[PDB]
Amino acid sequence: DAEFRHDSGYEVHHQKLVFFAEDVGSNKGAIIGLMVGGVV
Amino acid sequence: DAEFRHDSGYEVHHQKLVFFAEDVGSNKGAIIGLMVGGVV
Amino acid sequence: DAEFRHDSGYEVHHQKLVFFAEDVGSNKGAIIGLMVGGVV
Amino acid sequence: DAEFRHDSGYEVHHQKLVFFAEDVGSNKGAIIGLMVGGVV
Amino acid sequence: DAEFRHDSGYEVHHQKLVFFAEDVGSNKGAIIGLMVGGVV
Amino acid sequence: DAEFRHDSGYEVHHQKLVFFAEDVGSNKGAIIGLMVGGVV
Amino acid sequence: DAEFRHDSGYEVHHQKLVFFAEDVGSNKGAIIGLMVGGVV
Amino acid sequence: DAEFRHDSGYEVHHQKLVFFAEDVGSNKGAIIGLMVGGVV
Amino acid sequence: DAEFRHDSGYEVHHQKLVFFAEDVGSNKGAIIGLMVGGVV
Amino acid sequence: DAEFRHDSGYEVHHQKLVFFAEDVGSNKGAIIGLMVGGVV
């Protein structure tokens, strides 16, 4: 008379999660508000 | 008289999740608000 | 007299999820609000 | 007298999901609000 | 006297889903609001 | 013996120029690359 | 014996120029690359 | 014996120039690369 | 015997220039690379 | 025998220049690279 229940609400085996964020709100280039040249 | 229930609400085996975000709201190029040249 | 139930509400085996977002709201090119040249 | 039920509400085996988004709301080209040249 | 039910509400085997979105609301070309040249 | 020449190559009096561009390459509505719902 | 020449190459009096660009390459609405819902 | 030349190459009187750019490459709305919901 | 030349190469009187750029490459709204919800 | 030349190469009287740049490459809204919720 055995029972053997395995009711683990969440069972996870060999899970591999990678969350990668790169370059979020980053500036790798020029941002210039104004360029003014040769103004008389 | 065995039972053997395995009622794990969520059972996950060998899951591999990759969430990749790149270049979200990023500027890799020029943003210039104004260029003004040769103004007299 | 065996039973052998396997009622896991969610059963996942060997799932591979890739969520990839690239270049979302990103500027890789020039954005210029105004270019003004040769104005007298 | 066996039973052998396998009523997992969701059963997934060897699923591979790829969600790819690229270039969503991204500018890879020039956007210029105005170009004004040779104005007297 | 066996039973052998397999009533998994959703059963998925070897599913491969690819959702690909590219170039959604993206500008790879020039957008110029105005070009004005040679105005006197 | 008067002369009174007025040879101005370009003579402009009381000119009013309005160049208006609105909504050029602009999205005021939804753009969705894919909607997928209820897929099994 | 007067002369009175007025040969100004470009003569401009009371010129009013308005160059207006609004909403050039701008998104005021939603852009979604993918919406995926209820996928099993 | 007067002369009275007024050969100014460019003569400008009472010029009013307004260059306005608004909302050039700007996002005032949502841009979402992916929305994924209810995926099993 | 007067002369009275006024050959100023560029003559500007009462010029008013307004260059306004607003919201150039600016985000006033949400940009989300991915939203993932309810994934098992 | 007067002369009275006024050949100033650039002559500017009562010029008013306003160059205004606001919100150039600025984020006033949320940018989120990923939101992941309810992942098992």
Numbering used by the authors:
A (entry chain A), B (entry chain C), C (entry chain E), D (entry chain G), E (entry chain I), F (entry chain J), ...: 1 to 40
Describing publication, verbatim:
The major pathological hallmark of AD is the accumulation and deposition of amyloid-beta (Aβ) peptides (amyloid plaques) outside neurons, followed by the formation of intra-neuronal tangles of the protein Tau, the loss of synaptic function, neuronal death, and irreversible damage of the brain tissue. We investigated Aβ40 fibrils formed from this monomeric Aβ40 in the presence of negatively charged liposomes composed of 1,2-dimyristoyl-sn-glycero-3-phosphoglycerol (DMPG) by magic-angle sample spinning NMR spectroscopy and cryo-EM. Here we present the cryo-electron microscopy (cryo-EM) structures of six lipidic Aβ40 fibrils that assemble from three filament folds, providing structural insights into fibril–lipid interactions. Indeed, the three lipidic Aβ folds are identical in the central β-strand formed by residues Q15 to A21, with only minor differences in the sidechain rotamers, but they differ in the conformation of the N- and C-termini.
The L1 fibril, which is most populated in the cryo-EM dataset, is composed of two intertwined protofilaments of the same fold, related by an approximate pseudo 21 screw symmetry. L1 is also dominant in the NMR spectrum (vide infra). Indeed, hydrophobic surface patches are formed by the L1 structure that faces the hydrophobic acyl chains of the lipid molecules. In the case of L1, extra density is located between Lys28 and Val40, extending over 3.3 nm, corresponding to the combined length of two acyl chains in a DMPG lipid molecule. In contrast, the C-terminus in the L1 fibril adopts an extended conformation in which K28 interacts with E22 and D23. The L1 fibril also reveals a compact N-terminus due to inter-protofilament interactions mediated by V40. During molecular dynamics simulations of the L1 fibril, we observed that the hydrogen bond between D23 and K28 breaks but also reforms, with the hydrogen bond being present in 52 ± 1% of all conformations, in agreement with the peak doubling in the NMR experiments. Furthermore, such interactions are present in the lipidic L1 fibril and in both ex vivo Aβ42 fibrils, supporting the disease relevance of the lipidic fibril L1.
